[PDB]
Amino acid sequence: VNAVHWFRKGLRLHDNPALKECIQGADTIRCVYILVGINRWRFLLQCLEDLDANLRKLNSRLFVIRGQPADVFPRLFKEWNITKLSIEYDSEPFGKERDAAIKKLATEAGVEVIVRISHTLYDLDKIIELNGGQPPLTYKRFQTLVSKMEPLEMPADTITSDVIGKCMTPLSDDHDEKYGVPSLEELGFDTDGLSSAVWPGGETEALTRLERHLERKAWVANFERPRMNANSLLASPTGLSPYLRFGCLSCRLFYFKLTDLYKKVKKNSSPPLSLYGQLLWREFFYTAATNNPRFDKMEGNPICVQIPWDKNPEALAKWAEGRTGFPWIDAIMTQLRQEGWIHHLARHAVACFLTRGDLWISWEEGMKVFEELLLDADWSINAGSWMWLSCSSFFCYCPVGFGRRTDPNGDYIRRYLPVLRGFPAKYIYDPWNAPEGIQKVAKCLIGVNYPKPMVNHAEASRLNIERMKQIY
C-alpha cells in the first residue's frame, strides 16, 4: 500500500483528515506539491519549507514536482506504484474542475481517491441544498442556514510519529536537487534588495499566531471587537488571514479553540455567531462562488449587476502603483505592494476610491490587483468583496480626511511614503495645499517629486453618486 498526499492548500500537518486517512493502513507515504506577485510566491515557498522541515521530524520529506498535474500523476502512478491518493477538497470552480479530471485518471488506474473537506468549516454543497439549490446571497440568510447545520465535528488528529507508525517514506540521496523546495530566484524573480517578509509563511508561524490571537480575543476583548487605534493599520503579530487562505491554519481548529475558550470564560454558555464572524464571512463567499465559474467577472455572471464602468488605463495604473496624489490612498497601496496585507478598513478606502467613489473603474480591475498582491485574497472572498463594495451584487470615504482622526500626525503616511516625511501634519494628507516654502524644505515639490491629486474628490464623488443613483 503506497499512499500519496497532494498538498495544494491545507499546507499543514494538523487537522488534515485527508492525510490521516491516506496514511491509515499504508506501507509508504509521500507528500507532494505540484508547481501572483513576489510576496505571494515567497509566502508559498516558506509554507513549503516549513512543511518539509516538519515532515523531516517524521523521517519524511516534501516532494515538490514541477509540471502539470494531469501529466505528473500518471507517471507517478506507475513509477511509485501508487495505491492511494488523497486531497483536501477545493470548492472553487477552477479547482473543482481540475480535481474532477485527476479523480477520473486516478480511479481508472485503480488508485483509491480520498477527498476530505477541511478548507471550510462546512460542506458548502449541504448549505446550498438546505437553501433549495442556490447559495444564499445575504449574510443573514447564510447565518440562518448555519444555525440549522449540524455541530461541527472535532478536528482530525495531527499527523505524528505515532500516526505514521511503520509507514515510511522512500528517499534518495539526491532528494534536495530533485524534489527540493524552489527559491524565488529559481522561479526567475529578481530579489536584489528585497527585504525580509513581514508575513512569514508556514504552519509553525500560523499556530503560534493562533495562540496569541485567542489570548487577546478572550481576555483583552471580552470576546468583543475592540476599537481601532493608530497602529491598527500596521501588520499585527496576531493576524491570521494569510495563514487561513493558504491552509497553514485550519479554520476548524480556530473555530473549536475559540468555542472552547468562550466556554471556559463564559461558563457553559454557547457563543453567538458573531464570535465567528471572520470565519463565517469567509464561508459565505466560498459558498456563493462554488457553483459560479464567473464569480470574478461582471459579464456572464448571473449575480452581478452590469454597470458601465470607465476604461481608464492611466487612472488604474496610478491607483495600482500608489501614485494617485492622495497620500492616504497611496500609502495603503504601497503597504499592499510591499507587505501583502492591508487592513479591511484600508481595503474599503482604496476599493471605494477605485470604483463607486472617485475613478469609476470596474471592480474586476481592483480585484485583479488585489489577487496579485494580497496574501489573504482567496478568489471567492476577493471577488465577492469587490462586487459587494462596488454595489454590483449582494445589494463615500474621503481620500483626504478619513485617516486623520485616528492618525492625526500622519504616521502611517510617513512610514510608507518616505518622499513626504518632510511635510508637517498640517499638510501630510493634502500636500498639494502646502506652501511652496514647505515643499522646498521637505524637498518634495507636488507635481514633481510626488504627483498632484489625480482627481478633485468633491467633484468626482458627486458625479459618481449621481451615476450610481441613476443606475439604481
Ligand X SMILES: CS(=O)(=O)N(Cc1ccco1)C[C@H](O)Cn1c2ccccc2c2ccccc21
* Separation between Cα atoms, residue 1 and residue 363, nearest integer Å: 49
Look-up of cell digits 464570535: 275
Interaction between residue 301 and a copy of itself (CB under 8 A): yes
SS3 at position 264: helix
Among 265, 441, 463, 465, binds a copy of itself (CB under 8 A): 265
- List the Cα angle 344/349/355 in 5-degree steps: 115
CB atoms within 10 A of CB 290: 22
Interaction between residue 225 and a copy of itself (CB under 8 A): yes
At a CB cut-off of 8 Å and minimum separation 6, what does 403 contact?
328, 410, 412, 413, 429
Look-up of cell digits 463615500: 396
Among 165, 182, 277, 408, binds ligand X (CB under 6 A): 277
294 binds, among a copy of itself, ligand X, none (CB under 5 to 8 A by kind): a copy of itself
Strand partners, 114: 86
Q: What is residue 92's DSSP assignment?
A: S
Minimum CB separation of residue 319 from ligand X in Å reads 13
385-424 footprint of a copy of itself as x/- string (CB under 8 A): -------------x-xxx--xx-----------xx-----
341-380 footprint of ligand X as x/- string (CB under 6 A): ---x--xx--x------------------x---x-xx---
Give φ, ψ of 425 to 5 degrees.
Answer: -60, -25
Strand partners, 297: none
439 binds, among ligand X, a copy of itself, none (CB under 5 to 8 A by kind): none
* Separation between Cα atoms, residue 29 and residue 217, nearest integer Å: 38
Helix (H) or strand (E) holding 283: helix 277-289
Q: Are 387 and 381 in contact (CB under 8 A)?
A: no
Interaction between residue 192 and ligand X (CB under 6 A): yes
- Our CB check for a copy of itself shows the closer of 59 and 170 to be 59
- Our CB check for ligand X shows the closer of 64 and 381 to be 381
Interaction between residue 79 and a copy of itself (CB under 8 A): no
Interaction between residue 231 and a copy of itself (CB under 8 A): yes
Interaction between residue 257 and ligand X (CB under 6 A): no
- Our CB check for a copy of itself shows the closer of 153 and 190 to be 190
For binding to ligand X (CB under 6 A), which residues are involved?
Answer: 192, 241, 277-278, 281-282, 344, 347-348, 351, 370, 374, 376-377, 381-382, 385-386, 388-389
